[PDB]
Nucleic acid binder design. Structure first.
Lengths: 377, 64, 98, 349, 134, 393, 62, 129, 117
RNA sequence: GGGUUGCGGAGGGUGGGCCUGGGAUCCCGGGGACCUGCGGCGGGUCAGGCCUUUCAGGCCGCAGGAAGAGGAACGGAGCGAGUCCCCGCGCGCGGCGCGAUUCCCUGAGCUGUGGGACGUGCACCCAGGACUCGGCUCACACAUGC
C-alpha cells in the first residue's frame, strides 16, 4: 500500500542518457505507460520504437534506490516519420495474445508489432478512392478491445482486429452545410458512456456515438489546433490542449455549449504537449514549453470547484514534451526536446574582432534524457 | 520531388537520388516549373535572355 | 452456391505478403487461375479466394486472400494448394490473335 | 558541299540506285526548311516538355489555343502527375499519329516500399525476373472488357537504392500500353514487402527523346508573342520542326515531278514515275515517297523488291495509303505520254 | 575557409547572376535581414511579391544565385527596373532561408522598413545603387 | 559550317546508269552479271526474299551446322533437335559414330529434298591413330600415309553390322601434322568422299607399319560446303533460342543459328525465270524459252543448275540442256528438265492457261479443226505444224 | 581425350597434341561439352551471358 | 609474372577474382578442410545437394572451356543467396583437392572448429567488389 | 534361283582339293614382305588381274597349307594382303625370298569391281 | 513384282538382250503415253515370332494436270451516323487547375520552385481498329519533248 499524495519535491531515482546521441539532433516525445504498467514506449526524432522495461517494484519499495540505466528490451525500425502510437486497451501480462502495440507511419500503412517477440504480426492498410494510400493521424484503441479508430483528412475510418484487410467502416464528417475541420489530431474514448470525442487542428471539437456514429455536440478550440485530449474518470469531465496557446480549457458534459473554467499554460512553439491525469482525480500534472512542469489540484466537495496549483518544478532547461504517471506505484517520467533553427551568425567577424559579444551558437548543448520522479506520502 | 539529375560528360542525362554530386556540383530538379495560361510576363523573358545571350537564337544552330 | 467437387492442384507456398499468401504456380502445365476463385486444401476446406495475379508467361505467381477466422502462420511450410477446375482459362488464344 | 551533310530527307542521295536521269525540272516547288510560316506552323511536330501539374488533355488545349490552330493531337495520354516527352502535331500532321501512338516508350520512376530489405542483390534479382511478357491489369476497377492485358518488356535495371529512406529509382524500356504502378505493385509483392509508385518520368517517347530539342511551352508563348509584336519568325522556327523528320528511318522513293500531282489526286506509282530507290525494300513495307527537292508527298506500301524493280519495265510498285500533300500543287499532265497517250488517242479516234 | 566557400558558391550559380555583392556587403545584408525579420516586416514568395508590386511597394529585392530552372524568376528584375527598384543577388539559398528564421531554402525576399532600423538600410540601398551593372 | 535553308536540287545529269550488285544477299549476289533476255513481265506480289522471310518459314525452311557431342549418336541428336524445335521431320547429312565429333548439316522440312545429294559429298576427317609397337622415325609414317592415296579398297568393320562386301573409295589428300613417340599417338588430316571409313584406314596404316593399331578418336572439319569456320553452333544455343523465343519473343537468336536453305546451292549456276512459270514448274513441267529471263555465262550441256526467282527463292534444281551461245540465238525449245522440287505446289497464282499460242490452240480445239489427242488433223497452216512438234511431240 | 587446338592468326583451327602453345597460350579441348536432354538451366545461362555481353545476338552476321 | 600468365589464360565470364594472398589463405583453408571432414568435388553432386540446400562456399576454376560446362552454377548460388569465388588455376586446385586430375567445382562445409579461418574468408568474399 | 557347283550338293572341275585334300592346281599369290603381329602380310607379284578370296588357304612350293588370307588392302596397282597363321607354326621360319601360292579358282576379276554407269 | 541357268565338294558370293513366232541374206505380224512428292521392299537369334532401318536398284498403291506460260490502269483519295474491341469522372458529374480581389504557416502533415480557408468567374469532357448504310468534289490516271 503506497499513498499517492504531493507533499515534497519529486525525487530522482534513475535515468537514461546513453542513447539519442548518435544523431546530430534528436527529440524525445510521448513516454506513456502500459495499462498494466510494466512497459514504457519512447519515440525519438529518429524513427526507432524503444520499449523500456519497468524497474522492479520491490526495488522501489525501499529508499536505497540507486541510479541505473534502463536498457531497451526492444529496438524496432521505421522508415518514414511516425504520427501516433498507443498500447492495447486490455494489455496484461497474463494474456500473451493481447500484448501488441500499434503504430502509423507517414506513407507506410498502420503497422502492429508484438511486445513478446518483437516482430510485425499484422498490418491494416487503407486506400483512398483511386489507388493510393492515405496517412493516418489519430491512433487509439476501443475499451471493449475489438475495434480500432484512426483519423484522416475529413473522415474517420474504423478498423477491426479479426480481419486484417481492406474492410473498414467509413464515417464522413465534412458536408455541404456541416463539417468539423481539416486534419484530425487525435481521438479519445470515455469509459462512462459509449461516446468518444474527436479533436482536430482547426479550432473544432465534436463527440460521436460508438455504434450509431451520430454527432451530439460541436465546440471550437483555443486559437489554433487541439493536440491532446483525455477524459476525467470520476465523471463527466475532460480536458483538451492546443498548440501555440497560453490558455487551457476544461469542457464538461453537464454544461451545454460553453467552457466552464479556463486555465493557463505555456506553449510557444507547435509542439505535442501531453498532460496526464490521475485516475483518482486529485492531481493534474502538465508540462510547459518554457521548462516548468506545473501541477494542479481538482477539488470535488460539491459546491465550490477550481483547479488550484499545488507546486511547480523544472526538470531541465529544455521543453518537457511528455509527462505521464504510473497507474498504481508512485512514479513520474518526463522527457525533454526542442528544435534548433539554423542561425548563421557572422562567425568571421567574431573571430576577427574578439570584442563585445564573444559568443557562438555552435557550442549550444541540447540533450534529451528520460528521468523518473518519485512521489511520497 | 526527390528526383535530381546532373549533366554528363558525353551530354546525356544521368538521374540520381542524392542532392550533391561527388565531383562537387549541385544537382537540380528534373521536372520543369508549372505553366500558367494567363501569363502576361512573356515580354520580359526575351529581354532578360537577350541581355545575357541565352536565347535559342543566340545559341549555335541545330545539326540536322 | 456450390458444393465441393473434384479439385485440381493450383500452386505452392512461397512466402506471405501483408496478411496475404503469395504462392507459386504448380504443374497444371498450361492453366491460369480465375479471379476470386475459391482455393481449397488437402482436406477439401475453403481457405479463401484468388487475389491479383502477376508473373511471366511460363513462371507466374499469385496471391491468395484469407477467409474469416483464418491465420497466415498456420501453413508456414511447403504444401500444395488446390483449385476447382472450372476456374481455368486456355491461354493458347491469348498470344495468337488469328 | 558533300552529299552526306545535306538536310533531313537529303542525306546520301547518290547511294540511291539510279534508273533514269532525264526529267524536266518544274518551276513550282519548295524545300521543307525554307517553307512559309503559314505552312511551317500548320505542318510539323513539336517536342515540348509537359508540366507535372496539369494533364495532357489540358496541355494540348493550351498549345492549340496559343498556336491558334483547329486540330491537334498528342503521342501518348500521360497522367496528370507525370513528366516526360510529348509529341504534339497540327491539322496537317495528325494523319500519322496513329502509328506514333503505338511505339516503344521508356519510363523512369521511383518505387516506395513498406518493410525492410536485406540487400540490393535480392531486389535486383526480383527486378531482373520481371522481364519479358507478363500479365497486367488496370490499377482502377474496370468491367469485363479490361480483364487481362499482355505486354512485353525489353530491358529493366535499377541505378541506386536508399535503405535509410526506403526508396529507389529504376529505368524500364517497354512498349506503349504497359503500366508502371502495377509494375511496382508486383515488385513489392514479389519482394514480400509491398509498395507502390512514388513518381514517374518519361525519358523516351517513340523516336524522339529529351536530348533532341527539348523545348518548353514558355518558349512557345515567347515565340507567339515575338511573332506578333516584333514580326520575328526565327524564334518561331527554332521551336517548330517539320513533320518530314519523323519519317527519317523509313526508306525513300524519289519520283518525277509529273507524278507528284497524280499521287496527290490519288493514283498508283508506276515504273516510269520512279526515279531512284533504296536498297533493301521488301514486299509490303511502309515506304514514303519524296520529291526531287525533298518534300514528302505521301506514304505508300511497296509491292516489288529491289531485285524485281531493277529488272522490271512496267507495273505497279507502290500503293497509295495516306496522302500528306495538297491537291493543287503541280500542273495537270496525265495523258501526254509517248506511247500510252498515242494508244489512247488511237482508240479514241 | 571563407574564400573557399565563396568560390564553391560561385561555382554553383545561375546564368543571370552578374549583379553581386562583396563579403562584408553580404554580411551587412544578412544582419539587416535578421534584424528586420524579428519585427515581422519581411515577405517571402513570388506570388505576394508580384501581387504587391502590381500595386506598388518600395523596398530592396533579394534574389538567390543558385535556383533552377531560370523561368522561375525571370520577370522580377525587369519589373523592378520598370518600377525603379533595385535588386540583390547572393550565391546562396540555405543561408538566405535560415536568416529568415527557418530550416528551408528561400530565394525571393522583399524588405520593408517600419521601425528606426533604417540607418543601416539606407547604407545598403546606397551601396546597391552603386554596384557595377552588366 | 552549318548551312541552313540552302538551294538543294538533284541536277539532271544525262549520264549512264550503273548498278553495284556485289553486296546483295546470298542468291541476289551478282544479279546484273546475268545476260539479259527479256524485261517484259508482270511480277506477282506473293513472294519474298529468303533473308527477310517469316520466322514460321525461317524455321520450316533452312539448314543448320551443328557440333555434335561425343556422348550421344547422330540419330539421337537429330531427334533432340526435332523435339526442341517442335517439328515433324528432320534429317542429317551423315551417319556419324557415337564417339566421332565434327560438323553435321541438318535440314528440317523443305530442305530435306536434296539430302540425297548432300549425303554423297566429300568430307574431311581428323582423328588420332593409336599404335602398339614403336616406330623408328616419322618419315616412315609419312611415307606410309602418302602411300595410301587415291582409290583403294575398304572392308566394313565388325562394329556396324557385319562384313558384307568390298567397296572402292577414293582419297584426295592425306598428311600428318605431329607424332609423339612417348605416347605412341599422332594426328592426321584426311580429305576424301563419303563412304570412306577412318577406322579401317587406321587399321590399314597399322598393318603397313607392321605394328598394328586402331582409330582412337575422330573429328570432322568439313562436311560438303559447310565447315567448322562457318557459324558453327552447338545444341545449347539451339535450346536457348526456343526459350528466348517463347519467353522474350526475340527471333534474332533463332535467325542467327538457323540459315536459309538457299545457301547450299550457291556454287551452282542460277537461271532466272518468270513468275507465271514458277507454279507450273512446281506442279511439274519443262522450262521453256519465253519463261527464261536471265542466264549465267559459261553454261555447258547436262550441267547441274538451280532455278531461282527474281526475288531470290530457289524454285528447284534442273539439268541445263542448251548453251549460252545457243540460248542467245535459239527462239523456242527445251533448255532444262525438272529434277527435284524444292518449293511447295501452291505458292504462286496458278496461271498457265492463257497465252499467245496456248489460247489460240485451245480456241482451235474448241472450233473443230484441231483435236486434243489427235495431232495429225487437217492443220491448214503448215508453219504451225512445223513449229509445235519440236519440244517432245 | 588428347585433342587440343588454338586459334590461328587468320582465324582457322590448328589441331595439336601438346597442351601448351609456343607463343605462351594454354590450349583448350576440341570436343564439345556433354549436353543433357533434361536441362532446365537455359535461363541462367542466358542471363549470365547477357550480363557479360557474350551472346551470339550481339555478334554480327558475316 | 605467374599471376599475369594465369590472367592471360582466363575465362571470359569471371569477375570475382582474388588477390595474391587471399588465394593462398583459401588454398590453406581448403587443404586443412580436405582432411578434417569432407570436401565435395563434382558438378552433379554439388547441384544435387544445392537442390535440397547446403550452405557453403563454391570454388570454381578460372580456366575451363567451354563456358557452358559451368554456366548455371553462379546464378543458382545467387538465387540461393550463396557466395562464390574464382581462381585462375586448375592444376594447383586439383592437386590441393585430392592430388589428382584437375577439378573445377569445390564445396566446403564446416564441421570442426576450423571455422575461425572460414568466417574470415566468408566476409572477405562478401566484401569482394 | 540358285545352283551350279553345289548349294545342296557337290561337284568338281579344273581345280580340286580345297575341301577334298591334296590339291591339283596352284597359282602364285604373294611375296613375303614382313610379319605383322604374328600375321604375315604379302604383296601380290603376278596374277595380272586378280585379288584373293576371303579366308583362302595359302600354300608354299611343296603344297603345304601355311595359313589363310585374313585381310586385304592396298591400292589398285600396289595391292597387299595379310595371312593368318595356323597352329604349330613359326613366322620366323619363312624369312627368305620365297613365293606364296594359292588355288587358281580362288580369285575375282576386278573388271566387275570397276564402276560402270 | 515374279521366274530359270553356269562357274570354287558341300544353306555363304559373282554373272547373262530389242529379240522372238513361221517359210524358203530377204519378206510378213506385234509390243496399246510422260513428269513431280511421300510410304514400303534388308540384317540379327531359335515352319513361325521379336527389334531396328536405306548405300545399291526397279516394282506396287494413292493426291493434281494435259502444263509452248497474256495484260503501258480493276480501280483511288478527303467526310457524317450506328455497334464491338478500345480510353484512370468504372456510363452518380462536380473530392479538378490557372487568375484580380482577402487571410494564415517556418506545422512537429504535404507545404513559400507551394499548401490550408472564404467570396467572384472564365476554361476544362477527347482519340485508334473492324463492319453495314446514306452522301458530295476531283479524276478514271504508265508520267514525253525544248
Amino acid at each position: 500500500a503506497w499513498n499517492y499524495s504531493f507533499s515534497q519535491l519529486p525525487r530522482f531515482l534513475s535515468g537514461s542518457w546513453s542513447e539519442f546521441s548518435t544523431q546530430p539532433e534528436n527529440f524525445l516525445k510521448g513516454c506513456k505507460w502500459a495499462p498494466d504498467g510494466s512497459c514504457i514506449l519512447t519515440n525519438s526524432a529518429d524513427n526507432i520504437l524503444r520499449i523500456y522495461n519497468l524497474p522492479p517494484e520491490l526495488y522501489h519499495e525501499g529508499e536505497q534506490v540507486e541510479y541505473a540505466e534502463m536498457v531497451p528490451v526492444l529496438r524496432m525500425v521505421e522508415g518514414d516519420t511516425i504520427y501516433d502510437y498507443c498500447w492495447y486497451s486490455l494489455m496484461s501480462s497474463a494474456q500473451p495474445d493481447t500484448s501488441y502495440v500499434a503504430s502509423s507511419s507517414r506513407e507506410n500503412p498502420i503497422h502492429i508489432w508484438d511486445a513478446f517477440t518483437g516482430e510485425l504480426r499484422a498490418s491494416f492498410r487503407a486506400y483512398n478512392h483511386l489507388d493510393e494510400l492515405t496517412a493516418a493521424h489519430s491512433l487509439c484503441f476501443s475499451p471493449d478491445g475489438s475495434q480500432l479508430f484512426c483519423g484522416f483528412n475529413r473522415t474517420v475510418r474504423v478498423f477491426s482486429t479479426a480481419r486484417p484487410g481492406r474492410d473498414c467502416e467509413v464515417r464522413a464528417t465534412f458536408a455541404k452545410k456541416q463539417g468539423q475541420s481539416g486534419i484530425i489530431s487525435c481521438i479519445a474514448f470515455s469509459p462512462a458512456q459509449p461516446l468518444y470525442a474527436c479533436g482536430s487542428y482547426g479550432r473544432s471539437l465534436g463527440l460521436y456515438a460508438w455504434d450509431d456514429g451520430s454527432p451530439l455536440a460541436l465546440l471550437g478550440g483555443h486559437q489554433g489546433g487541439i493536440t491532446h485530449l483525455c477524459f476525467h474518470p470520476d465523471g463527466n469531465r475532460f480536458f483538451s490542449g492546443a498548440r501555440k496557446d497560453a490558455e487551457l480549457l476544461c469542457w464538461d458534459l453537464r454544461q451545454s455549449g460553453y467552457p466552464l473554467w479556463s486555465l493557463g499554460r505555456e506553449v510557444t512553439t507547435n509542439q505535442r504537449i501531453y498532460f496526464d491525469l490521475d485516475p483518482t482525480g486529485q492531481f493534474l500534472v502538465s508540462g510547459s514549453t518554457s521548462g516548468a512542469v506545473s501541477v494542479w489540484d481538482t477539488d470535488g466537495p460539491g459546491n465550490d470547484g477550481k483547479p488550484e496549483p499545488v507546486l511547480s518544478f523544472l526538470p531541465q532547461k529544455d521543453c518537457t514534451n511528455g509527462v505521464s504517471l504510473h497507474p498504481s506505484l508512485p512514479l513520474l517520467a518526463t522527457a525533454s526536446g526542442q528544435r534548433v533553427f539554423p542561425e548563421p551568425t557572422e562567425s568571421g567577424d567574431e573571430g576577427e574582432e574578439l570584442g563585445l559579444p564573444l559568443l557562438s551558437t555552435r557550442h549550444v548543448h541540447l540533450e534529451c534524457r528520460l528521468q523518473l520522479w518519485w512521489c511520497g506520502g | 520531388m526527390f528526383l535530381q539529375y546532373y549533366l554528363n560528360e558525353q551530354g546525356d542525362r544521368v538521374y540520381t537520388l542524392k542532392k550533391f554530386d561527388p565531383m562537387g556540383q549541385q544537382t537540380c530538379s528534373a521536372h520543369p516549373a508549372r505553366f500558367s495560361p494567363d501569363d502576361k510576363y512573356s515580354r520580359h523573358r526575351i529581354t532578360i535572355k537577350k541581355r545575357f545571350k541565352v536565347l535559342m537564337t543566340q545559341q549555335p544552330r541545330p545539326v540536322l | 452456391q456450390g458444393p465441393p467437387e473434384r479439385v485440381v492442384l493450383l500452386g505452392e507456398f512461397l512466402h506471405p505478403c501483408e496478411d496475404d499468401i503469395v504462392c507459386k504456380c504448380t504443374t497444371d502445365e498450361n492453366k491460369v487461375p480465375y479471379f476470386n476463385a475459391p482455393v481449397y486444401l488437402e482436406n477439401k476446406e475453403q481457405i479463401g479466394k484468388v487475389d491479383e495475379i502477376f508473373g511471366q508467361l511460363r513462371d507466374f505467381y499469385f496471391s491468395v486472400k484469407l477467409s474469416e477466422n483464418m491465420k497466415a502462420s498456420s501453413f508456414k511450410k511447403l504444401q500444395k494448394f488446390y483449385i476447382d477446375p472450372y476456374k481455368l482459362l486456355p491461354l493458347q488464344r491469348f498470344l495468337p490473335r488469328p | 558541299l558533300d552529299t552526306s551533310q545535306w538536310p533531313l530527307l537529303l542525306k546520301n542521295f547518290d547511294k540511291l540506285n539510279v534508273r533514269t536521269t532525264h526529267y524536266t525540272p518544274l518551276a513550282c516547288g519548295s524545300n521543307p526548311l525554307k517553307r512559309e510560316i503559314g505552312d511551317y506552323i500548320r505542318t510539323g511536330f513539336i517536342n515540348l516538355d509537359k508540366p507535372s501539374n496539369p494533364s495532357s488533355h489540358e496541355v494540348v488545349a493550351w498549345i492549340r489555343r496559343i498556336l491558334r490552330v483547329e486540330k491537334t493531337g498528342h503521342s501518348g495520354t500521360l497522367d496528370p502527375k507525370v513528366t516526360g516527352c510529348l509529341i504534339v502535331c497540327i491539322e496537317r500532321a495528325t494523319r500519322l499519329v496513329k502509328s506514333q501512338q503505338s511505339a516503344g516508350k521508356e519510363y523512369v520512376g521511383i518505387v516506395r516500399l513498406h518493410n525492410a530489405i536485406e540487400g540490393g542483390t535480392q531486389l535486383s534479382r526480383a527486378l531482373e525476373t520481371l522481364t519479358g511478357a507478363l500479365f497486367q491489369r488496370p490499377p482502377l476497377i474496370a468491367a469485363v472488357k479490361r480483364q487481362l492485358r499482355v505486354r512485353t518488356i525489353y530491358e529493366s535495371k535499377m541505378i541506386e537504392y536508399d535503405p535509410e529512406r526506403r526508396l529507389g529509382i529504376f529505368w524500364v524500356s517497354c512498349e506503349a500500353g504497359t503500366y508502371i504502378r502495377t509494375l511496382c505493385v508486383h515488385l513489392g509483392l514479389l519482394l514480400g514487402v509491398g509498395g507502390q509508385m512514388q513518381e514517374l518520368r518519361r525519358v523516351r517517347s517513340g523516336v524522339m527523346s529529351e536530348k533532341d530539342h527539348m523545348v518548353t511551352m514558355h518558349d512557345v508563348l515567347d515565340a507567339q508573342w515575338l511573332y506578333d509584336n516584333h514580326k520575328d519568325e526565327s524564334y518561331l522556327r527554332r521551336v517548330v520542326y517539320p513533320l518530314e523528320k519523323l519519317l527519317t528511318s523509313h526508306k525513300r522513293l524519289v519520283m518525277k515531278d509529273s507524278a507528284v500531282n497524280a499521287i496527290c489526286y490519288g493514283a498508283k506509282i508506276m515504273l516510269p514515275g520512279v526515279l531512284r530507290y533504296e536498297d533493301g525494300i521488301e514486299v509490303n513495307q511502309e515506304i514514303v515517297v519524296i520529291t526531287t527537292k525533298g518534300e514528302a508527298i505521301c506514304m505508300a506500301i511497296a509491292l516489288m523488291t529491289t531485285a524485281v524493280i531493277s529488272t522490271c519495265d512496267h507495273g505497279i510498285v507502290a500503293k497509295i495509303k495516306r496522302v500528306i500533300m495538297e491537291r493543287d500543287t503541280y500542273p495537270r499532265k496525265w495523258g501526254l505520254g509517248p506511247k500510252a497517250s498515242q494508244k489512247k488517242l488511237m482508240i479514241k479516234q | 575557409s571563407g574564400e573557399r566557400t565563396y568560390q564553391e558558391l560561385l561555382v554553383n550559380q545561375n546564368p543571370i547572376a552578374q549583379p553581386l555583392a562583396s563579403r562584408r556587403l553580404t554580411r551587412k545584408l544578412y544582419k539587416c535581414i535578421k534584424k528586420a525579420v524579428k519585427q515581422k516586416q519581411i515577405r517571402r514568395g513570388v506570388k505576394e511579391v508580384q501581387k504587391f508590386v502590381n500595386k506598388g511597394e518600395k523596398g530592396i529585392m533579394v534574389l538567390a544565385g543558385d535556383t533552377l530552372p531560370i523561368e522561375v524568376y525571370c520577370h522580377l528584375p525587369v519589373m523592378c527596373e520598370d518600377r525603379n527598384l533595385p535588386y540583390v543577388y547572393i550565391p546562396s539559398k540555405t543561408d538566405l532561408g535560415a536568416a529568415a528564421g527557418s530550416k528551408r531554402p528561400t530565394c525571393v525576399i522583399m524588405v520593408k522598413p517600419h521601425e528606426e532600423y533604417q540607418e543601416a538600410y539606407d547604407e545598403c540601398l546606397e551601396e546597391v545603387q552603386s554596384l557595377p551593372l552588366p
